[PDB]
Design a binder for these strands. Structure first.
Ligand SMILES: Nc1ncnc2c1ncn2[C@@H]1O[C@H](COP(=O)(O)OP(=O)(O)O)[C@@H](O)[C@H]1O
Lengths: 311, 425, 78, 157
RNA sequence: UAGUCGGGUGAUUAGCCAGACUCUAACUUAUUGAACGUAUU
């Protein structure tokens, strides 16, 4: 029985039990609200433990094609690589997608399966109903035909990465010929070039390609299409790009960290803010290693050693 | 959580500070306070802080204006983007190029700010599903995206107004939450401690209708502070409301004898000075109570005449200036000069009914009277453009079909240039 | 049922709670639509009741015979 | 057909006007620069001029049934601020179009623009002097030939 | 000139000092999930 047989082999459970579980599985989500950083809330639906294990086993079993321009949910690749792809460049065209994860329906996933340019696992027609139960979330209890991908599920990142394999391939192919580098952190397309007046023609290409591939289901967020250059602030997915073509945390965050270290110097920092500063300095060491050396010079090596890791 | 909000708020974030204030207030005898004295004080100081520059004009520390507008399948525009200036933006072009459409979209966006200032969760105006969607659009929906700036602590306030065409199964929602949040901040802070409120006004072609003093039982109370938001984006400023308010001020001043000085007299004097300074022909305005119906009289070219004997052009401009001055005075009680309050004012065809002599100074007078107001104006005249900087002008190409992405400034400096040159180029 | 109103500019909005009355009237309307039932009569007679007759009377035939015309202007005062 | 020809030949943007049945109801649609918007989608500049021309043409058509061209009929038409809501491009041809559509009508208009005056003969202009308190007893024509002159010259002199 | 970048000082998210940039043109975001860094291990 193909997919269910493999899931039983990996999960050490009977095929019948797994098949019985994957009947109301799209309804097996607990939805909760996480706070936004400024104001409001974000609705996240997280599957139950059993469905989570099923999704993890499924994604480990079947490897879908992903593009090298995708820097999100990839092993060995992350925020720093995405920012450093455009570290040496002058103009940039940060763009966004409109409700990316919730716009991926089973129809989109199955359509992208059959027209993929790369190798795709062969799925029997018997297990195509079970795949939808495994992967997709069913947000309205009365409507059973509304299935969407939910951010917060283990399977959703790789499914969303694969659903834009062809989009990434076509965009990269059409974009490298005009000397523009392209990346995507799974919802946030980044373009940059050293040639002026070439990025202004990119959003139309993105719109027409999205219409060609996903039809009306997936679309750009026209309010989130931002042009920038060295005359203005330049940041890619959280990392500020300096006018010296180097990655940085920004002046404001680096002064915030300096204030935190100065507070810790005089014992004005409690346990929670101390842990927050140790976490932020680990992140700063990852992104901008020279900041750690500069803080060692400014606040002495002994104080930093007492705060940061000792062993 | 609490600590992230505290870290953002102490860094200058207005939204986080307001969130902290509301939460801490909730616990009346618990953690927090009434003026949270940290969070409420920071919010009110953010809204109220400012300094007088070298020219004697009060400048708010965190200015409020509209940064960007995107129009998607709205009227004739497939996808248009504008980069309005902080102080003055002038949109020019041929007839039927979409300037009035842009002003209409901006007014529809500002109606949500006005509605949520007036009421909690109030609903503003919405795009029409019969005439606002582009006729030959394939998608059958329209978007009007905007971004507002309210200082470094609130750099982006995105609001999107959307409407699907009539008889379309799939409807499009509007993202109006950030405007509601900003107006909630304004209203809640104002309730606890009075603060200066922004002025949003639209002056369409719908103005310049005849004016007769037919407004007696007009239901609403013109002294009430929040009457300055009533019909303020309808297109025709309520000049009858101004007449009632002015007569009320005159009555309170003539019937009177913290410093035993009436603030109504100060408001009346400020409005009088504004009207006399902006309108060229009008030299002095007052209220006559003998011949015992109340009458407003102005001095036109040295002749005392009544308010309904003004010409079309001295009465329309007077109505605009008087309405704007009244709303600014009522919405800025803590300012030494209430006309220096902030806000967004849209004027359609500013040269309407005006002689070329008056067009040479309308923009300068308007900007001198209201220095912190962001004016977004359309015009059909080289004379008005000769008094306006090149960077403030957004021109439509003469061969546009609506598929232009970004409106631009002309390549020729218009300020101080001859009228023939501006006409030709 | 509560009919609430708040002044302009108040930090919190005061709204009505007309849901139970709406539920009772929904019961009335739905039951009547399925099978005819007797309906309540709400009327208000103010001082404006004393108005002169107008003799010649609009021949707006067609709406005075419908059953739900008994709710037309029934709380206007006259 | 007469009204259609009058409307299309005077309003620069209107190419064709016709009545279409939409959802049963009848509505009027016009052609603006190759697009087929309806009347209430017109701008304040095209709609006002269209209403003026259409009203005048309808009045002439009803009042002149014995003429092969009803627009060539007698009458007196007063227009206040003829250039209202009009771009300077349209002001260069607002007088010629009106006087070619309505040849026998005496037009008495007021204007605030020199672009309109550039298309009008000097003999047809009555000007109020800038220093006029109302005691003067004659409205006089300018002392420059405004027809065919520069914008700057008409604006200055 | 703005605006932006950020090396230093600063009981330090503020203020100041030096330096630099300018396609019409950043607006700093989201967990418990995924990956990254770090710590136990
Ligand atoms: N729904 C629509 N679809 C297509 N074109 C439209 C639509 N609504 C309006 N238009 C066009 O847009 C223009 C509207 O004019 P307007 O915005 O008032 O311009 P202006 O300020 O230059 O007078 C007209 O040319 C009209 O034909």
């Amino acid at each position: 029985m193909s997919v269910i047989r493999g899931l039983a082999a990996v999960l050490r459970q009977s095929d019948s039990d797994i098949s019985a579980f994957l009947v109301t599985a799209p309804r097996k989500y607990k939805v909760y609200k996480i706070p936004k950083r400024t104001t409001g809330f974000r609705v996240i639906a997280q599957p139950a433990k059993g469905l989570k294990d099923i999704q993890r086993a499924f994604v480990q079993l079947y490897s879908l094609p992903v593009h090298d321009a995708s820097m999100a949910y990839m092993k060995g690749k992350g925020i720093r690589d995405n920012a450093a792809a455009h570290a040496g460049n002058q103009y940039l065209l940060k763009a966004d997608l409109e409700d990316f994860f919730n716009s991926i329906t089973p129809a989109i996933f199955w359509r992208c399966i059959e027209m993929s340019s790369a190798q795709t696992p062969q799925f029997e027609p018997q297990d195509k109903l079970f795949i939808e139960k495994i992967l997709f979330w069913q947000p309205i209890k009365r409507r059973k035909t509304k299935l969407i991908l939910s951010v917060g599920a283990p399977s959703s990142p790789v499914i969303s990465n694969f659903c834009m394999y062809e989009f990434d391939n076509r965009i990269h192919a059409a974009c490298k010929k005009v000397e523009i580098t392209y990346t995507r952190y799974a919802d946030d397309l980044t373009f940059s070039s050293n040639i002026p007046d070439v990025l202004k023609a990119v959003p139309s290409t993105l719109e027409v390609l999205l219409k060609d591939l996903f039809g009306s289901a997936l679309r750009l967020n026209h309010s989130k299409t931002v042009f920038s250059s060295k005359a203005h602030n330049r940041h890619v997915t959280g990392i500020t790009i300096n006018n010296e073509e180097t990655l940085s945390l920004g002046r404001d965050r680096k002064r915030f960290i300096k204030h935190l270290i100065n507070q810790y110097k005089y014992g004005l920092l409690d346990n929670e803010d101390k842990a927050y500063l140790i976490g932020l300095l680990a992140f700063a060491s990852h992104i901008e290693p020279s900041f750690i050396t500069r803080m060692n010079e400014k606040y002495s090596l002994e104080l930093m050693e007492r705060l940061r890791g000792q062993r | 959580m609490t600590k992230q909000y505290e870290r953002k708020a102490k860094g200058g974030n207005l939204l986080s500070a307001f969130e902290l204030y509301q939460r801490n207030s909730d616990k009346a005898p618990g953690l927090g306070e009434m003026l949270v004295g940290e969070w409420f004080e920071m919010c009110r100081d953010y809204i109220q802080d400012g300094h007088v520059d070298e020219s004697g004009i009060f400048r708010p520390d965190n200015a409020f204006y509209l940064r960007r507008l995107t129009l998607k399948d709205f009227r004739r525009f497939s996808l248009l983007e504008i980069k309005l200036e902080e102080d003055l933006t002038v949109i020019i072009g041929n007839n039927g190029k979409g300037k009035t459409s842009i002003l209409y979209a901006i007014a529809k966006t500002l109606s949500w700010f006005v509605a949520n200032i007036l009421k909690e969760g109030g609903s503003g105006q919405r795009l029409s599903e019969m005439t606002d969607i582009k006729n030959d659009a394939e998608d059958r929906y329209s978007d009007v995206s905007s971004t507002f700036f309210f200082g470094k602590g609130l750099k982006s306030v995105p609001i999107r107004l959307s409407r699907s065409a009539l008889g379309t199964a799939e409807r499009r929602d509007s993202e109006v939450k950030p405007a509601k949040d900003l107006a909630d901040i304004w209203r809640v802070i104002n309730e606890v401690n009075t603060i200066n409120l922004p002025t949003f006004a639209l002056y369409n072609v719908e103005r310049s209708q005849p004016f007769n003093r037919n407004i007696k039982d007009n239901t609403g109370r013109r002294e009430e502070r929040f009457d300055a938001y009533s019909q303020t984006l309808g297109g025709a400023g309520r000049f009858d409301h101004f007449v009632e308010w002015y007569i009320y001020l005159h009555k309170r001043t003539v019937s009177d004898i913290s410093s035993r000085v009436l603030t109504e007299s100060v408001q009346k004097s400020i409005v009088e000075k504004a009207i006399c300074s902006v309108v060229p022909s009008i030299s002095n305005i007052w209220v006559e109570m003998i011949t015992g119906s109340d009458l407003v009289k102005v001095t036109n070219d040295g002749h005392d005449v009544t308010i309904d004997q003004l010409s079309d052009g001295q009465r329309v401009f007077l109505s605009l200036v008087a309405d704007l001055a009244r709303r600014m005075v009522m919405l800025n009680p803590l300012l030494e000069n209430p006309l220096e309050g902030r806000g967004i004012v849209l004027i359609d065809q500013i040269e309407l009914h005006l002689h070329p002599k008056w067009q040479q100074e309308v923009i300068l007078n308007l900007r001198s009277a209201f220095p912190n107001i962001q004016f977004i104006i359309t015009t059909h005249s080289p004379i008005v453009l000769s008094t306006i900087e090149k960077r403030c002008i957004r021109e439509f190409e003469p061969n546009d079909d609506g598929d232009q992405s970004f409106l631009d400034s002309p390549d020729m400096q218009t300020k101080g240039s001859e009228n023939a040159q501006i006409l030709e180029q």
